[PDB]
């Protein structure tokens, strides 16, 4: 069977970036031509591989991570980047081998008055390790004052809603991101190209 790339790219709802979804794609034939020749994508950057060279390569596993962020934040989905998203939500390794794909989803993920259902982690004690996920919602203590609950001025609920509005500037509009992670372990190669 052909790889189910359409399940990831064309899903109706994407996860919040702090709870990014990972889809393992294995034991299938991957026609990467549908992806690069789509022209509907606003970002298609690969690291360490070319899309043309990917049609003729094989890999043990291919992971497809997907989420929604702001347009101005897509630049953080790249190796060696800093910022709220890369530090606290989704971290790519410095030696990342794979592709980062994003498109504008303002038509799908914005709401008049705001879409509060997409969130990102704004507070965290330590930066994330590559491909680490954190979906906890413990109250964050920002000062030297203890935190009973969020009731303090320095006690924060750690997630933050984007509140996507259709009339946002393009940089603030929601973008759907799919991160293709190509893994080649010393094991049978289950994913190949046409």
């Amino acid at each position: 069977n052909l790889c189910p790339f359409g399940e990831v790219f064309n899903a109706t709802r994407f996860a919040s970036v702090y709870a990014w979804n990972r889809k393992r794609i294995s034991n299938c034939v991957a026609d990467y031509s549908v992806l690069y020749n789509s022209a509907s994508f606003s970002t298609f950057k690969c690291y360490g591989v070319s899309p043309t060279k990917l049609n003729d390569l094989c890999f043990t596993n291919v992971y497809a991570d997907s989420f929604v962020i702001r347009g101005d934040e897509v630049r953080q989905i790249a190796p060696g980047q800093t910022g709220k998203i890369a530090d606290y939500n989704y971290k790519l390794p410095d030696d990342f081998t794979g592709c980062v794909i994003a498109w504008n989803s303002n038509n799908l993920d914005s709401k008049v008055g705001g879409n509060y259902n997409y969130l990102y982690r704004l507070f965290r004690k330590s930066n994330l390790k590559p491909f680490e996920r954190d979906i906890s919602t413990e109250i964050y203590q920002a000062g030297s004052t203890p935190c009973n609950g969020v009731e303090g001025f320095n006690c924060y609920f750690p997630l933050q809603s984007y509140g996507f509005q259709p009339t946002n500037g393009v940089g603030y509009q929601p973008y759907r991101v799919v991160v293709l992670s190509f893994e080649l372990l010393h094991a049978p190669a289950t994913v190949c190209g046409p």
Epitope: L122, V150, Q160, Y162
Partner: nanobody, 130 residues
């Protein structure tokens, strides 16, 4: 569309008072928080007070608690900061900011995180003479 504009400020002697205003225009978010922040020379911009758009709940930094009052006139959609009993350490550039409330598990949170305010004003200087 969205714009926050500060007014008020200036020079006062210690013990004096000021009233800052923040005109919020073009705002369409259903639920949001509006906060006053300040940045003293060489220091990091810190939050001073925060107010909810839904019921006017307020929170204050410890350094200003009891002296500063944040309030909102929903008619004019203007947020005010009444600053009483001013001290030299209150000297800073003062900003108002707005950010959406956060929805999680059936509940909205109204927070004014200095590092996550989607909309900022231009800032107005406040100088307490000493």
């Amino acid at each position: 569309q969205v714009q926050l504009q500060e007014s008020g400020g200036g020079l006062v002697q210690p013990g004096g008072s000021l009233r800052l205003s923040c005109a919020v225009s073009g705002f369409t978010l259903d639920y949001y928080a509006i906060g006053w922040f300040r940045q003293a020379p060489g220091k990091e911009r810190e939050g001073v007070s925060c107010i909810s758009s839904s019921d006017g709940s307020t929170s204050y930094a410890d350094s200003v608690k009891g002296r500063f009052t944040i309030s909102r006139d929903n008619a004019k959609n203007t947020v005010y900061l009444q600053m009483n009993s001013l001290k030299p350490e209150d000297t800073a550039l003062y900003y108002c900011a707005a950010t959406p409330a956060t929805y999680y598990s059936g509940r909205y949170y109204y927070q004014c995180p200095a590092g996550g305010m989607d909309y900022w004003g231009q800032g107005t200087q406040v100088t307490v003479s000493s």
